[PDB]
Amino acid sequence: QLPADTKDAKPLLKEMKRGKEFHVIFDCSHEMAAGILKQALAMGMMTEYYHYIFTTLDLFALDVEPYRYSGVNMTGFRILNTENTQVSSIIEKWSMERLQA
Amino acid sequence: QLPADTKDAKPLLKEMKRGKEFHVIFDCSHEMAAGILKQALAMGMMTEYYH
Numbered sequence: 001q002l003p004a005d006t007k008d009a010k011p012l013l014k015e016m017k018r019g020k021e022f023h024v025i026f027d028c029s030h031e032m033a034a035g036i037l038k039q040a041l042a043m044g045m046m047t048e049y050y051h052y053i054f055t056t057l058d059l060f061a062l063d064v065e066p067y068r069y070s071g072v073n074m075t076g077f078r079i080l081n082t083e084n085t086q087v088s089s090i091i092e093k094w095s096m097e098r099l100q101a
Numbered sequence: 102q103l104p105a106d107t108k109d110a111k112p113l114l115k116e117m118k119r120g121k122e123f124h125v126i127f128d129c130s131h132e133m134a135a136g137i138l139k140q141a142l143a144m145g146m147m148t149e150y151y152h
Contacts, residue, residue, distance in 0.1 A: 047145050069111075070145030 002028070006035035013043050022049055030058040037067065046070040103129070107136040114144050123151055 002012065016024075026033065033056055040046060048071035059076030081087045103110055117125070127134065141147045 041142075044148050047148055066143055069143055072145070 002032070002036070006032060007039075009036055009039040010043070013039055013045065017043065017045060023051055023053075025053045025055065027055050030054075030056045030061055032056075033059070033062060037062070041067065041070075046072045048072060051075075103133070103137070107133075107140065110137055110140050111144065114140055114146055118144065118146055125151065 002009065026036070028036075033054060040050075040052075046067055050072060052072065052074040054074055054076040057077055057079055059074060060078045060080070060082075080091075082091070103113065127137065129137070138147075
């Protein structure tokens, strides 16, 4: 279990690394995925050995960049149908009004 | 040999990782050490393996 605070992530990952858990499933609002991935990097773990999975349906929303050359796979799950033209159009339109926040 | 700027450095680290060169000596004014180590990190080239 992830402890209460996000930045307490350290021991848990540390135990996982010591125990040599070479697969992981997550389950949490991607907002938690950000914290857990930053730890998973700074703890020197993003290596093509480990191979995460996410059930949070918003991985597409992360910043995949600083991790992408490392060679981990995070198979995930997305439903918002980016494939269709009109869907993407409406995404963009809503985006042009989304950024007022 | 490291290239002119830092961006050329990544193709090199790629070779080091591919051939599995598990040790290194560097040489640079540390100002180069910083960028080369950052690349060393984001390349998945910074673990308990290498030294």
